[PDB]
Every structure is written in C-alpha cells, then in structure tokens.
C-alpha cells in the first residue's frame, strides 16, 4: 500500500509538471479554440469582399447612387454576405456534430471510467483500469485516468495442467510456472507463486488427454491433518 | 468489414473555377476568401484521413514479428500472418481482400501517410503480438505465453471452464483453422462481401466525377467554355457572363466540400469504431454482447484492406 | 538536394537511410524533420522499435512488479 | 458433476425458496474421515 500510495502520489505530480511544462499539451482544446475563432474572423473579413458590386462598404454604395442602380449594387452584396454566412453555418453544424459526438464520448467515459471501473481495453488510458478523475478545463474535460501496469516481466517454464494419481489438475484462477525444479500456481498479472494443491486447483478427467501436461505431486491439506 | 479513411483530396478552385484565364482570376478575388476556405476545409478532411487510419492501426508501440517456430498448439495462422512469397509481405487473406476493392481541372488525389505496406506492417504487429501474448501487449509489456494456454484464458473469459479446452484443443483447433478456411472460400468466390469499402470508393470517385461534369453546365451563360465568352465578348458584357460560371462553379465547389465534409464524419465515425474495435477485440477479450461479431467473444485477427480494416473475429 | 518521393519531387530535402518517427508527414512513408550544420532531412517513417516475443509452446512470463500510471485524457 | 459441499454453498434452510428439490449433496470429508 506505501509503495502504490507512492507511485499515484508521483504520477499525480508528473501531470502538474507535464501541464506547467508543456503548453502544447491541451491543443485538442486549443484547436477547437481557434477553429472557432478562425471562421468567426473568416466570417468577418468576408464584409470587406466586393463581391462584384462597385464597393465592399454599403455606404458607398447608398451615399453615392438611388435605389434605380443601388438596389443592383446591393443585391451583389447581399447575395455574397448570405452565401458567407450560409458557408459558416454550414460548417458550425458539421463541427458542432464533432464535438456533441466528443462531449458523447466524455459523458461515456465519465458514466464507464469516473462512475465505475471498465474492463474495455484502452478505454480508460492504457494499462488495466483502476479509476479516473474528472478535471474541468475551458470549453472540455481532462481524466486523470489511473492504471496498473504489469512491469517487471520474468520468464518462467509452464503448464496447461498437472498430473497427480492418474488425475489431470489444472488451476482454479492463475497458471502453473516453474522456477525451473520446483512447480507453483501464481495468479496472472502479479508473480506470487503458491504450493500447488487439492484447495487451489480442480480436477477434470486423467493424464490421457492434455496436450503437454506434467508431472509434480499436489499437496492435500487434510492429509497431513488427518493422517497425523 | 469497416472503413477507416477515404481518397484524400485536394482541389486547385483557381484552376476548377477558371484555368489560365486571368481575367476570370481577377473577377474571382472579388468573391474573397470562398478558395482559401474550400482549401482549408479539403486539407482538414485530408489530415483527418491520415488520423484516422493511425489511430485504428497505430495501437502497437513496437512492431512484433511470430517466432521462426509456429508452434501453437494446432492452430494454424499461415493464412492470416505475413507471406514472405509476396512483393510486400500483406498475409494470404489479405492479398484476397486488396483483390475484392477496385483530372487537369485542378482535381488531385493526394496519397496516404501510411503505404499498404506499412498498414501491413502494424496488423502483422498487432496480430504476432495478439498471438504469442495474448492481451497483455495492449496493457504493457507483450509477455509471451503458450497459444493454448492464452485460448484457456479465452474460454475462462466466456465463462467455460478451462479444462473445456485443453480437454478438446484438437477439436478447437480444427475448428477454427476450418473457419479460416471458409473465409478464404467467402473472399475468393463473393465480391459483395467488401461492399462497405467499395462504396467508399465509388461515392468518392462519383463526387469527383459529378464536380468534373459540373464544368459542362453553362448556368445561364453563352456558353461554359470560358475562352469563348473572353473570345466573342468585350469587358462589360463578357464579366457579366462569367460571373455566372463562377457562381455555379463555386456553388459547385462549396456543394462539394460540404458532402466531403459530412462524408468525411461519417468515415470518422467508423474509424473511431475500428479503433474502439482494435482496442477491445484485438488488444483485448471484449464482453460486450455483439460487439466482436455474433457469439461469445474469444480473439480477433485485424488484417488490412484498401481504405479499411478486416476483422476475423 | 533532390529526391523523388512517390508524393512528388522533393527539393532542399537531405534524403537519409536512417528512419526516425514522422516529425513532418510528406506521404507514402516519407517524412521530414530539421536536424544536425543544420538540414531539413527526408526518410522512410519508422513504424516503432522492432521487437521478437520469446515465443514457445512451454515458456511464459510473469510480472514481478508493477507500475501505477496516471495519464491524462 | 456430483452435488458437493466444494461445488455448492449453503443459505436459509427449505421453507423460503420457490421450487427447491430434495437430493443428496456429498460431503467429501466425511468418508475420507469415516475410512
């Protein structure tokens, strides 16, 4: 429990070094950012397009004619500026579809990784999953997502099952490893090897069968207790 | 079958609206910043693409290759992992897939970051590390495991007791190495099957064609030949003419990249499947009803197609 | 100084053997990035280290130890 | 399998589930104890 206290204590200060470092860091937000405010600004410098009337300025165009010519002069104007404006609503709609199916996304993963705990494969970060924290950020939303991650590996021989009298064993939850003369059943994702026997293993039919079964006595804990 | 990225474009509008005609270049910088804003939208698009299929096969930090061995316990990958026969190393099944999938007005095509064969590089990374390490190359380290061992872990993971495998593994493994076969039988003799990317190619082909045709259509003018209207007219009536060519050619256009662009969302909702796909049936054992096809989930094998991934689930 | 890429001719780009992740994406598996006397080089994107897994049909491995990892979404 | 005390867990007695049956569950202590 210390050393896990340590190393989320560590990782946690990571992430204020990584953000206080590193500006770049948000540009999923900052690019939404300036989408918007990049066809807002398109948006704008549009009025200043002549759009083939004698002026882009519809002052010009109303100081210095009437309405017999103006009315020609400004249907220009007004045919550009709504087709300006249709363009960027268009494309408000088309980016709007992008972030509600992102804002779905973040209110999935605050239901699945925030509320709960997933099973889903790199849905909650990479590693296995064991929680997530929401911070807000402008126009979005950060999870800290914290996971195990299996990390020093040894190389171990192992079995399918193993033979006792004439019954094939195999384990209840874990695998059978070898330290290479003596055999242990350990769970999967952490080396913690354990004597083999009758409690942590399940018998199914005989050593016929299994492709690469192996030899080694299964300890039974009445045995010892019952005999002596 | 599911798309990843389609044909990215980019689209010269000087060139499509007039070509070599500076007097109609000079009547289309009336209409402002409508070109820079199709290019821009275009090159959005076309990025995306690029994304999109990184974000589906880039999954794999280090390119796993299968031992010189295959010693898996029966089942027989040899259709499914790299041919070392071919020019560029795609497997058997995927040679039947990129079989089954099939100008100067400014138009061009721009190629993909990744070639065929570096996308067959990452399936054959994701499919040696799926192989000889189970899940365990998604979470970390690939850590190596016996292939009947990692199917023990499957059959655990649907609630069948292991000894249910290694008790039949000859049976399993026939079974499935049958399987593989039969999608060999599917792919060589039934082209419909990769209908889902070869309409991607074809709306992509049909709306470069359609913008193409476009430029026929005269849109009230004398004629859409644009160096007739310069040739037979004078300045104050043939500017007249040619602002309607370059009314209908930019509404042309912006008809153009705004399909693109709610076409370029629906592929990027399919590649964001492919990708939740690739994380949760190939790097992992979903339980999600459904999601890894119709049955209780084991494994999934991701080969490549064009503009698309496969998975054998 | 000069080199055909399948994405067009390339000018002012130092072609290099030598592969890298993509820094400046080109197309076809090419990249570019500025590096050391100072160029822009060109060159076929790495894909990630290259790795073998210590495959057999009785070897496993196991974690000794592990990581708690906290990453940002 | 053979009903067992290893493959099953007791809780309440035969009054207060719907459709309970009568059957043997044995015990694999109590012949090795008995022998």
Not at chain 1, 208 to 225: F, H, R, S
Not at chain 2, 7 to 22: A, E, P, Q
Not at chain 2, 117 to 132: K, V, W
Not at chain 2, 190 to 218: I, P, R
């Amino acid at each position: 429990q210390k050393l896990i206290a340590n190393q989320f204590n560590s990782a946690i200060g990571k992430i204020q070094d990584s953000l206080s470092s590193t500006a770049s860091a948000l540009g999923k937000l900052q690019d939404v950012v300036n989408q918007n405010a990049q066809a807002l600004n398109t948006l704008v410098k549009q009025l200043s397009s002549n759009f083939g009337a004698i002026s882009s300025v519809l002052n010009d165009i109303l100081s210095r004619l009437c309405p017999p010519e103006a009315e020609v002069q400004i249907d220009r104007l007004i045919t550009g500026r709504l087709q300006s404006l249709q363009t960027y609503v268009t494309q408000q709609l088309i980016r709007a579809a992008e972030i509600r199916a992102s804002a779905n996304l973040a209110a999935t993963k605050m239901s699945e990784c925030v509320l709960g705990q997933s099973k889903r494969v790199d849905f909650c970060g990479k590693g296995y999953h064991l929680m997530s924290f929401p911070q807000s950020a402008p126009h979005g939303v950060v999870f800290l997502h914290v996971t195990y991650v299996p990390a020093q590996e040894k190389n171990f021989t192992t079995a399918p099952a193993i033979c006792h009298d004439g019954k094939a064993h195999f384990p209840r939850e874990g695998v059978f490893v070898s330290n290479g003369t003596h055999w242990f059943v350990t769970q999967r994702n952490f080396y913690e090897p354990q004597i083999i026997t009758t409690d942590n293993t399940f018998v199914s039919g005989n050593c016929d069968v299994v492709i690469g079964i192996v030899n080694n006595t299964v300890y039974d804990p009445l045995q010892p207790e019952l005999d002596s | 079958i599911l798309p990843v990225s389609m044909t990215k474009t980019s689209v010269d509008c000087t060139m499509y609206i007039c070509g070599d005609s500076t007097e109609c270049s000079n009547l289309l910088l009336q209409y402002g910043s409508f070109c820079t804003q199709l290019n821009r939208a275009l090159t959005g698009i076309a990025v995306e693409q690029d994304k999109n299929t990184q974000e589906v096969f880039a999954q794999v930090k280090q390119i796993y290759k299968t031992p010189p061995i295959k010693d898996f316990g029966g089942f027989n990958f040899s259709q499914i992992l790299p041919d070392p026969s071919k020019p560029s190393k795609r497997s058997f099944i995927e040679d039947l897939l990129f079989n089954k999938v099939t100008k100067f007005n400014g138009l061009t095509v721009l190629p993909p970051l990744l070639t065929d064969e570096m996308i067959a590089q990452y399936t054959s990374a994701l499919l040696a590390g799926t192989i000889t390490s189970g899940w365990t190359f998604g979470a970390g380290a690939a850590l190596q495991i016996p292939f009947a061992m990692q199917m023990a872990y499957r059959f655990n993971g649907i609630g069948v007791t292991q000894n249910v495998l290694y008790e039949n593994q000859k049976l399993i493994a026939n079974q499935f190495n049958s399987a593989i076969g039969k999608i060999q039988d599917s792919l060589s003799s039934t082209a419909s099957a990769l209908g889902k990317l070869q309409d991607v190619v074809n709306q992509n082909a049909q709306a470069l064609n359609t913008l193409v045709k476009q430029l026929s259509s005269n849109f009230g003018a004398i004629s859409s030949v644009l160096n007739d209207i310069l040739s037979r007219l004078c300045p104050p009536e043939a500017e007249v003419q040619i602002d309607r060519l370059i009314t209908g050619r930019l509404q042309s256009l912006q008809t153009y990249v705004t399909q693109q662009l709610i076409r370029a969302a629906e592929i990027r909702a399919s590649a964001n499947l492919a990708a939740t796909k690739m994380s949760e049936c190939v790097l992992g054992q979903s339980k999600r009803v459904d999601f890894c096809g119709k049955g209780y989930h084991l494994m999934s094998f991701p080969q490549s197609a064009p503009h698309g991934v496969v998975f054998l689930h | 100084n000069v080199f055909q890429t399948r994405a067009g001719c390339l000018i002012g780009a130092e072609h290099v053997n030598n592969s890298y992740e993509c820094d400046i994406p080109i197309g076809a598996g090419i990249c570019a990035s500025y590096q050391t006397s100072q160029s822009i080089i060109a060159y076929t994107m790495s894909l990630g280290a290259e790795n073998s897994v210590a495959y057999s049909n009785n070897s496993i491995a196991i974690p000794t130890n592990f990581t708690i990892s906290v990453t940002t979404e």
